[PDB]
Design an enzyme around this catalytic site. Structure first.
Site, mmCIF file in Angstrom:
data_model
loop_
_atom_site.group_PDB
_atom_site.id
_atom_site.type_symbol
_atom_site.label_atom_id
_atom_site.label_comp_id
_atom_site.label_asym_id
_atom_site.label_seq_id
_atom_site.Cartn_x
_atom_site.Cartn_y
_atom_site.Cartn_z
ATOM 1 N N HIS A 187 0.855 -1.222 0.000
ATOM 2 C CA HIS A 187 0.000 0.000 0.000
ATOM 3 C C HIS A 187 0.883 1.262 0.000
ATOM 4 O O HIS A 187 0.731 2.124 -0.884
ATOM 5 C CB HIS A 187 -0.976 -0.052 1.184
ATOM 6 C CG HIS A 187 -1.784 1.194 1.277
ATOM 7 N ND1 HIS A 187 -3.065 1.300 0.733
ATOM 8 C CD2 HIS A 187 -1.487 2.411 1.791
ATOM 9 C CE1 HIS A 187 -3.512 2.538 0.959
ATOM 10 N NE2 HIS A 187 -2.577 3.217 1.606
ATOM 11 N N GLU A 188 1.849 1.358 0.920
ATOM 12 C CA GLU A 188 2.678 2.598 1.037
ATOM 13 C C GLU A 188 3.508 2.797 -0.242
ATOM 14 O O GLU A 188 3.672 3.960 -0.679
ATOM 15 C CB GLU A 188 3.559 2.565 2.288
ATOM 16 C CG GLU A 188 2.777 2.477 3.599
ATOM 17 C CD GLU A 188 1.778 3.597 3.861
ATOM 18 O OE1 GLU A 188 1.948 4.718 3.310
ATOM 19 O OE2 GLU A 188 0.758 3.315 4.548
ATOM 20 N N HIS A 191 1.735 4.800 -2.909
ATOM 21 C CA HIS A 191 1.892 6.257 -2.669
ATOM 22 C C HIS A 191 3.263 6.723 -3.150
ATOM 23 O O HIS A 191 3.360 7.773 -3.845
ATOM 24 C CB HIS A 191 1.731 6.585 -1.188
ATOM 25 C CG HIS A 191 0.377 6.406 -0.614
ATOM 26 N ND1 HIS A 191 -0.752 6.941 -1.196
ATOM 27 C CD2 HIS A 191 -0.014 5.762 0.525
ATOM 28 C CE1 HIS A 191 -1.793 6.664 -0.436
ATOM 29 N NE2 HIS A 191 -1.367 5.950 0.653
ATOM 30 N N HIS A 197 -5.377 7.382 -2.446
ATOM 31 C CA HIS A 197 -6.317 6.387 -1.891
ATOM 32 C C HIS A 197 -7.369 6.094 -2.928
ATOM 33 O O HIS A 197 -7.761 7.005 -3.645
ATOM 34 C CB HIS A 197 -6.893 6.860 -0.555
ATOM 35 C CG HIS A 197 -5.890 6.668 0.526
ATOM 36 N ND1 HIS A 197 -5.775 7.524 1.610
ATOM 37 C CD2 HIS A 197 -4.922 5.731 0.673
ATOM 38 C CE1 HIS A 197 -4.776 7.109 2.375
ATOM 39 N NE2 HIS A 197 -4.246 6.001 1.838
#
Ligand SMILES: O=C(c1cc2ccc(C3CC3)cc2[nH]1)N1CCCc2cnccc2C1
Ligand SMILES: [Ca+2]
Ligand SMILES: [Ca+2]
Ligand SMILES: [Ca+2]
Ligand SMILES: [Zn+2]
Ligand SMILES: [Zn+2]
Length: 230
Positions: A187-188, A191, A197
């Site tokens: 997930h990170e 980014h 998101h």
């Protein structure tokens, strides 16, 4: 924290209250709640109901949902070979298991992007990875155990592209006790490649932590990356 206090803090931290201020509607909880229910794909009731409180108690990403700070550049990488440096380690897992959890997280993005991910041992890495507690040197402090698990910065120089993991959490592979370092890092790293998101609950880039043993990428994540890198 009361349910009401948690709600006010959640709305503030993730950028809902600021957008309600810009719409003349921050005097009462309802409008900001509707913004959050829309952003998180919850029923749009404008009430602090059971689904909304359950959402707000759910462990999640520290990156905001509406907005960001101002960063430099257009928030995507402008070279193919993305380097990463593991600056320090959680004591919760062996170093080889941590290294592998990050390698696997990068392997997920590598297949669906024109980018490669290579480990270095240098301050100049594109993506600096750091374990940290509370105030850990970027003025974006973690919150102790549970709540927010990690955060990351969009592409660019210096702190941009870096990923930080909250070491007041117990890091594991998500079995028995603790959060999967692999799923949070995946997930990170989204980014760190320029993604925001998703409002699709099943997407990797959905802000809430959701343990799975299945392949974590969704159509929405793959398409997000496609709209960035030619
Ligand atoms: O504001 C951020 C932040 C992260 C981020 C990730 C991706 C992107 C888009 C995809 C290109 C923008 C982002 N901004 N910050 C870095 C995350 C930490 C944080 C927490 N609370 C308020 C402000 C900040 C500052
Ligand atoms: Ca960086
Ligand atoms: Ca935390
Ligand atoms: Ca820890
Ligand atoms: Zn996130
Ligand atoms: Zn940080």
């Amino acid at each position: 924290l009361t349910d009401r206090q948690l709600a006010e803090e959640y709305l503030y931290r993730y950028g809902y209250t600021r957008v309600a201020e810009m719409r003349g509607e921050s005097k009462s909880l309802g409008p900001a709640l509707l913004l959050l229910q829309k952003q998180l794909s919850l029923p749009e009731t404008g009430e602090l109901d059971s689904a909304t409180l359950k959402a707000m108690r759910t462990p999640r990403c520290g990156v905001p949902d509406l907005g960001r700070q101002t960063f430099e550049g257009d928030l995507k990488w402008h070279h193919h070979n993305i380097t990463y440096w593991i600056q320090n380690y959680s004591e919760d897992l062996p170093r080889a298991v941590i290294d592998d959890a990050f390698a696997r997280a990068f392997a997920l993005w590598s297949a669906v992007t024109p980018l490669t991910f290579t480990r270095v041992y240098s301050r100049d890495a594109d993506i600096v990875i750091q374990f940290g507690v509370a105030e850990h040197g970027d003025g974006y402090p973690f919150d102790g155990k549970d709540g927010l698990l990690a955060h990351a910065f969009p592409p660019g120089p210096g702190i941009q592209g870096d990923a930080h993991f909250d070491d007041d959490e117990l890091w594991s592979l998500g079995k028995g006790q603790g959060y999967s370092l692999f799923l949070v890092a995946a997930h990170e790293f989204g980014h760190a490649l320029g993604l925001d998101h998703s409002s699709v609950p099943e997407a990797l880039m959905y802000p809430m932590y959701r343990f799975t043993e299945g392949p974590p990428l969704h159509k929405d994540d793959v398409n997000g990356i496609r709209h960035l890198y030619g």
